Each structure stands twice: as C-alpha cells, then as structure tokens.
C-alpha cells in the first residue's frame, strides 16, 4: 500500500491546476451540428465494430450476422462482404497497408483476411489462436504484427507470418474491452473491465503506467493525436482523459442527463473534439479542452456500438446495434 | 472520364452482386433462430447440446448446434470457452430469439446462484426483450433426492415450508406429492423473478426436462413459436 500511497501523493502534487480552468481562456467550440451525409445500410444484424483504412475512404464494419463488410464510404458501395466462421464478432481492423482486415470475438481466434489477393477474392490469410477468452479489440501495428485485446485479462502481440504469440501483456484484473495505439505505434493503452487502463510498451512487453479513476468497466479507449494522452469511456457513463506525462487523470466528461455507459470513443484529428458513443442510442461530441458537451449525434434506433474518426478528419462513422452505420461530416 | 465511368460501373456491379448475396443471407438468417444456451456450469448445458446433436460443431469453446425441427432451423450455442465474467459477452446475445436457461434443480446448494443469474439475465438492459426458456434439468435426480430426503429444501429455502402446490399444477405419471411440490416450488421461485419485471416485453417458459428427454426439441420449438407470435403481436400492434 506504500507504493499506491506514494503514487497518489505524487499525482496530487502534480495536480497543480484544472484543465477546464486553464482552457477557460480558449474560446469554446460552440454548437456542432454534424449531419448524416451517408447511411451505409445492408448489415443483417447489429454492428459490433468499426475501423477506417489508412486511405481515409474505405470502411470495415463487423456484424454479429458473421459479416465483415468493406464499404466505400464515398459511394456507399459494399466493396467486400466477407462471411465469417463465427457469427459473433466484436472486433474489426484495417491494416495500415490496407491489404489485410482482422476480426475476432467470442471464437477467441483472431482471423486475418487478405483483401488484396491475387486470386480475386477474400480468404482467411491467418487464424491466430492462443487467447483463452473473447476478443474485444484487435488492431494492426505494421500489417505484419497485430495486437489483440481479449477477455482473458491479457493482451497479446502476434506475428501474423509466424502465427505465434510473440508477446503477452498481463496485469489487468478484468476482461480487456478496448485497445488503442499511439501514433508512433510504440506504446498501446488497453483498458480492462476493472476501471483500469494500462499503457504497455510494444518492445518491452510490460506495463509502464497504470491509470485508475474510473468506477466501472472501461468499454472504449482512443488516443490523443499528440500521443501523450488518451480518453477512456466506461460503464459509469463518464469519460476520462488521462495524460501520460502527468501519469494521472487530467479531465472528466460527465453530465446529469447521462445515465448509460459509453460503448465506443474516438478523438478528433486535432484532439479538440472527443466523440463517444453512448448506450442511450445517441453519440456525443465533447470539447476535450472545455469538458463541455459540444453536440449530439442522434439518428440511431439502437445503441451506438462502434465509433470511428477517419484519419483525414473529414468524416465520422457511427455503427449502432440497429444494423445501421452512418457517416457524419 | 471513360476510365472513371468504367470503374464506377464495376463498383456498382460488385455492389449489386454483394447485395444479392446479402439478400440471400438475410433470408437464411431470418429463417434461422439463435438460442443462447445459458445456465450454471455445474450441469445441464453440454449434455443438452449433445442430445440435440444426436437428433453443428464447436472448436474453440463455443459448442454450437444447428438442429432443425420440422422445417425451421435453430441455432443453439453453448458459449463455454470464456473465463468468468458473463457480463460483457452477454451483451452480444441481445439479438437471439431466446435464452434456453438450463437450471440444475436437483442441486439446491447452487440453486440460489442459478436464481441470481436468472435475475441478472432478466433485468439486464440488453436482455429485456429476449425471452427465456426455463429448462429445469435432472428432474429424475431431483425426484430421487426428494424421495430419499437426505437434504431438505427448507434448509436452503425457508419459504418452502410455507409453500403449497398450486391448484394449476399438472403432475406427471407417478408424481409423488413431495417431488411435485419441490419441482413446482423451484418453478415458482424462478417465475417470481420472471414476473417481477418485464411488463410484457418477454416471458419465461418453465419446462421441466431430464438428461435423456427426447421432447426437448419440441419444447424449444413451441417456445420459439410463442416468442415470435408475441413479437409479431407487438409488431402488428395487436397489443
């Protein structure tokens, strides 16, 4: 308990001010009224996952009907429709190269599909196994190395070509429900269902900083564009922006009308807007500097289960349990 | 922009083919019914799944079965390859037709845990609209335990002493009064949780079964018929 007390004392000492008070001089973003430019419909069942390609145009949406649909967001044309061996898929990804798309879920197996194949179709390029729990978030590092967050309280780092668990990250007391990568792709922050988000070094394989302050299960993590901070959404309906430099909580986003936990979060390319999908069927965009609810993205008949901001910052994709994925700009 | 027009035409053709495949998949997916097979880990689940298979394959932990009754295809899945925390992977099963809840009613020590799990399933935010097919198992074991009388349910459930067999009970062949009273007490204990909330969104179907019972398929078929009949009645605005 001495180490925990010392860490708390250091965090309190470093807590010399509040982010809201410092940013009060900065003018607020006002009211944000993003509209649905495109509605990407065609999913049979609820959409559990979302990711944008590095080209900032293509989209991958995973649905518990066992469907990995690669949409062209510009034209609302399903470029690909990969059927999955396991119907219940909770994670999806784009490789940075774009030639591979990952999926996973209750099958405990991360399936990597080769999109750009010489045959002229989509096939299971790899089937990584070794996790003892459901996969909640798997994302590529360099298109030949994938970090997967599972429900066995441990994260894994696999070499796709080798197909073996090269690195294992342990220390979470609960199921990991989110996983985000720094823009430098050297450290990644994984949040478990224990109100704890741990930052792991990819090469070292051990946690460097554990962040607490949440009250319930963490369901979503996104990185700040600068890579020195990360926002976590949890079941206590409150987002928390932690700063790596301060090694403690920096900002809290909450309200009185919110009584439902966050499902997916996604920062804006500038970091001024923190987007967060909620269980109340509506997404919310917050001013990360001012902690004020900048705006609401309604329009989903069910809860917003996945939320992704494109690399170009031009649009957002909100996929809900109503088998609908909407594009906002 | 001839090349751009050709690329757009090819994109539209591929999207049309994918959409036709998706329409076929939608027909097949709506035609098939998903049944989340839940219950305490002590007993009931795997034996039922295997028996339904003998009437369809699990590799990484989820024991799936794609049995068909009459002309309707059912998908029952026993998700067993998961560590401890049903809270997070239960969310996914909010699109299933029903949750087949297998309760080892012969073991009174773990009966309270099964009741708490049933209450959590019933009162879960995402399982409000998902009906539960109660499937109290090992009725032969429960009858043998009651007839032997080694352990009394009054020790585990004091309210059983004041409980009396309901007038609407339908005793089986033989049906010793102690056995019938115990079985219907467990059924009423689960149905109290079932009726405490739901306001007509979903209903619990309390079927008693055994390990070697061959009527389980018909029970699930009739329960799914009633579930989708009520779903249509809500959809058709017939209350």
């Amino acid at each position, epitope marked *: 308990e001495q180490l925990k007390n010392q860490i708390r004392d250091a965090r309190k000492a470093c807590a010399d001010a509040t982010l809201s008070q410092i940013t009060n001089n900065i003018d607020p973003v006002g009211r944000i009224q993003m509209r649905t430019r495109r509605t990407l419909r065609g999913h049979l069942a609820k959409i559990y996952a979302m990711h944008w390609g590095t080209d900032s145009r293509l989209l991958v949406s995973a649905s518990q009907d066992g469907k990995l649909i690669i949409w062209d967001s510009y034209t609302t044309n399903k470029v690909h429709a990969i059927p999955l061996r396991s119907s219940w898929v909770m994670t999806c990804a784009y490789a940075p190269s774009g030639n591979y798309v990952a999926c996973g879920g209750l099958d405990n197996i991360c399936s990597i599909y080769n999109l750009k194949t010489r045959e002229g179709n989509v096939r299971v390029s790899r089937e990584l196994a070794g996790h003892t729990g459901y996969l909640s978030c798997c994302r590529f590092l360099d298109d030949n190395q994938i970090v997967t967050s599972s429900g066995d309280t441990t994260c894994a780092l696999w070499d796709i070509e080798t197909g073996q668990q090269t690195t294992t990250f342990t220390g979470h007391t609960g199921d990991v429900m989110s996983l985000s990568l720094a823009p430098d792709t050297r450290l990644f922050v994984s949040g478990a269902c*224990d109100a704890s988000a741990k930052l792991w070094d990819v090469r070292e394989g051990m946690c460097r900083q554990t962040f607490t302050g949440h009250e319930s299960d963490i369901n979503a993590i996104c990185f700040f564009p600068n890579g020195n901070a990360f926002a976590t959404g949890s079941d206590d309906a409150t987002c928390r922006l932690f700063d790596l430099r301060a090694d403690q909580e920096l900002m809290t986003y909450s309200h009185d009308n919110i009584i439902c936990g966050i499902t997916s979060v996604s920062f804006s390319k500038s970091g001024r807007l923190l987007l967060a999908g909620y269980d109340d069927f509506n997404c919310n965009v917050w001013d990360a500097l001012k902690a004020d609810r900048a705006g609401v993205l309604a329009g989903h008949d069910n809860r917003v289960s996945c939320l992704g901001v494109t690399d170009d910052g031009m649009a957002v994709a909100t996929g809900s349990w109503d088998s609908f994925l909407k594009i906002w700009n | 922009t001839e090349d751009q027009r050709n690329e757009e035409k090819a994109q539209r053709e591929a999207n049309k083919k994918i959409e036709k495949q998706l329409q076929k998949d939608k027909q097949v997916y709506r035609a098939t019914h998903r049944l989340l097979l839940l219950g305490a880990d002590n007993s009931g689940k795997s034996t039922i799944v295997k028996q339904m298979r003998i009437l369809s394959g699990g590799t990484s932990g989820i024991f799936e079965t794609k049995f068909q009754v009459d002309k309707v295809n059912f998908h029952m899945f026993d998700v067993g390859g998961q560590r401890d925390e049903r809270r997070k992977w239960i969310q996914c099963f909010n699109d299933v037709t029903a949750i087949i809840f297998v309760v080892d009613s012969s073991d009174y020590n773990r009966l309270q845990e099964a009741l708490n799990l049933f209450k959590s399933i019933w009162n879960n935010r995402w399982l409000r609209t998902i009906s539960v097919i109660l499937f109290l198992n090992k009725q032969d074991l429960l009858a043998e335990k009651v007839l032997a009388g080694k352990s009394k349910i009054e020790d585990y459930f004091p309210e059983f002493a004041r409980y009396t067999t309901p007038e609407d009970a339908t005793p089986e062949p033989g049906e010793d009064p102690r056995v019938t009273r115990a079985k219907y007490f467990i059924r009423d204990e689960f149905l109290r949780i079932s009726t405490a909330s739901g306001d007509g969104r979903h209903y619990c179907y309390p079927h008693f079964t055994c390990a070697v019972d061959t009527e389980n398929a018909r029970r699930i078929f009739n329960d799914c018929k009633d579930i989708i009949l009520q779903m249509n009645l809500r959809e058709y605005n017939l209350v």
Partner: nanobody
Amino acid sequence: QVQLQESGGGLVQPGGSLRLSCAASGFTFSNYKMNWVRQAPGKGLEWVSDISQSGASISYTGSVKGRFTISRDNAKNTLYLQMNSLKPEDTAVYYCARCPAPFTRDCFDVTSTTYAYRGQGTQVTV
C-alpha cells in the same frame, strides 16, 4: 482507485452477533447495487445478500434469510451486514461486491474469484 476494505470479523461463538462493515471508496456508491458474498473454506464462492441503491429491495440467501440483516448508509458511504445469529456453517471469508453497472438492476459478479470491484474480505469463524 476502487476500494472496498472490510472491517469486523474474527472468531465468535455460535449464535453470537458479528456486524461487518465495508469502507466503499472510489465511486459514488449512491447508485450501485451492493452485495455481500461469502467463500466457505475450500468451497466455492456464494452470494449472501443484495441491496439496491436506495436501500430497499433487500434480499438474502435463503440459508441466512432470517438472520443477517443488511443495511446501507449513503451519507456515511458505508454498508453493513449485522449477523443476528451465527452457525458453524457461517464460518467463511466475507467480501463486499459492487454491481458493475451503476444504474442497473442486475449484478454480474464473479464466481471463481477474479472480480475487481470487491473487497479483500474478512474471515469469520465459529
């Protein structure tokens, strides 16, 4: 940091009174449904009692339904389980389990001990 350190316990004669308390800190505690759970020596882990956010809708395991009155003080930010009677079968390690989702009526705590929103526990013997 979520903490649920338990106080009260130790050896007690059968039929005695041994009130347990939890110092629930790190969350609002005014909305989370709370539970008392017990682990017998070498025998699994069984839920004992439950109590809603407002203190009503209290329920207990039938084995201790008559005794073991549960209570919750939001202003004091604490929760107590008064054991009116004690039996040798009640000798176990008692933990306080917080419901995971705040404003929900369901509790999905863990059976084989891995739950995080749970105290270290206090051992009571008869």
